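Replying to the earlier thread about multi-chain prediction with a worked example.

Input:
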Amino acid sequence: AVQNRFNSAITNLGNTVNNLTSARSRI
Amino acid sequence: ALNEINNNLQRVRELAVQSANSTNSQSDLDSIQAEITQRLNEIDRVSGQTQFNGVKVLAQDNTLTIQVGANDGETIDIDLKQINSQTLGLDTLNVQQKY
Amino acid sequence: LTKNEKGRLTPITKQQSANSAKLTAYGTLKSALEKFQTANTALNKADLFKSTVASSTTEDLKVSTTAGACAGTYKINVTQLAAAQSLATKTTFATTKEQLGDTSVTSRTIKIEQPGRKEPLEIKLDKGDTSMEAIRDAINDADSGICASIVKVKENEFQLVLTANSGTDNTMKITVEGDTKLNDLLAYDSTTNTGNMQELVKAENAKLNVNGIDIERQSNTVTDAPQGITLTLTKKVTDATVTVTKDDTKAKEAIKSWVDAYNSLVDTFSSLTKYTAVEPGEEASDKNGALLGDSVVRTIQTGIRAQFANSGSNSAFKTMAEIGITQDGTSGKLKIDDDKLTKVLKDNTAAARELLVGDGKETGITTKIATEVKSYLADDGIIDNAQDNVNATLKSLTKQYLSVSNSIDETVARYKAQF
Amino acid sequence: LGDTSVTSRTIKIEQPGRKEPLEIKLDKGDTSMEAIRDAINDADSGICASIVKVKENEFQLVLTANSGTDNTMKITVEGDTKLNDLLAYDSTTNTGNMQ
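Result:
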């Protein structure tokens, strides 16, 4: 549970940084 | 914890195999009782000696969801399962035979 | 926008460097599993546990021991020694280059027949090969057992000597077809013991007595007298003693190599799962293992350490720890105490051999470990399946990188127009 | 070497030294000379079976005890008849089917 959830959460952190990059494009 | 519990698995397998047959004598079984105390100390080491986030979470159980990291709407639901002797039933493990 | 695209690269370049380090980790993992598989297969031979060492009191009798011998003491009495028949020509010749046979016939054949060989040996001499040196070279080049020599009895006289191998089944019956003078020179018949060549040595078998059993071999190297011990006879000994004692050195060294290989594998896996705790927790630490949290290392460790409790083995021992090797509490490493392992190898060698080696097909710790490591290290295994999934994700990411690089070009043009 | 009708047979070796007679069990297919050698050698109780090739296409079976006069064997085979005819000694009267 912890390991697969936090691997998907590392992927989700990459997704969040992608959203932050989109915001940087917006800014 | 997994290393400690697999070591315990190998220990208990040896315990059952040697107790079932006559290879391990009863003085050897007293040495095995000493080993039982030693593996109880092993459980105490996996519980107390190890620590989580500066706290002995392996010695005290807090089955609560962790605080939200504010990066996602949902909260991380970590059911912290400490390696305890009591709650997981490991304290009841004692293979010493009758004298 | 160059900085913005570098910020976009931050997890993209982080994942690219992670994939490079992951390919490196996969290579190191494959190398470690290859070394472990080599050591484990080296241990998978049962012949190491059935090993002995032999000694002899006499310097004449020489003793060696193969695999499968039995310990004990043997009293060897050698009565006879094997000898090889030698035939020498009667007429001495002036020179080794003088012609021996008739020069009219351009093709002749020497036909040697023995009880041993089933197809008679034919050696063909063409024109000009009738000299003594030519016959010697032909018979030595055939390489079929017969060994021609030349002897200089005294100045300007020579002889030709043909020697077979040891035993009474290697008596020669020589003939020469196609020539007459050579046939007059080289013609023997060991059935009636009549020929044109004298017999210098007589063929004999090797007779001996081992613990009251009468053994008769062809050569002076006796092999199956106790079926596990090889004896080389040199002289007629009387009441010699051979002592065969059990040995465990090879098995001990195999165990040492196996535990060292497993410890190295565990060390490599632990170093690959390395991590460093950072108090602020703002971002992941630089000293992080690429294969951290992946199912690869965890699955390999679980699969390998699950085989230490094998239900296939039917020996008295069911857990490998009873041999004398214990897995440390701190880390998944194995250590051996000499006393217990030595006692087990000395007394319960059969039980240890059944536990580790097993029947070789579907039994034993070593067999299960070998088949599991073969399945994991194979391309169809889950480890290479995960590697291929990562590679496919990386290829999709590469296409995404190309598209975003086109976006970089567009945005650079946009801000160049703006600025 | 033995009869194939009986699926289970036992070799019983008794010595003045050992107190409990040694029983070595041969199941079906273990009546070959190699199988008997392997069974007696795997029991690891002192007796050491060998094979001797006197000459091409003839072999013998040799059972050797340890040193001393307290290790004289009294072999018996129970469950089989042909094997009992082949392997049967008695060191008390020095009479048997094995030289």
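Residues 26-49 of chain B form the longest helix (24 residues).

Feel free to reuse this layout for your own posts.
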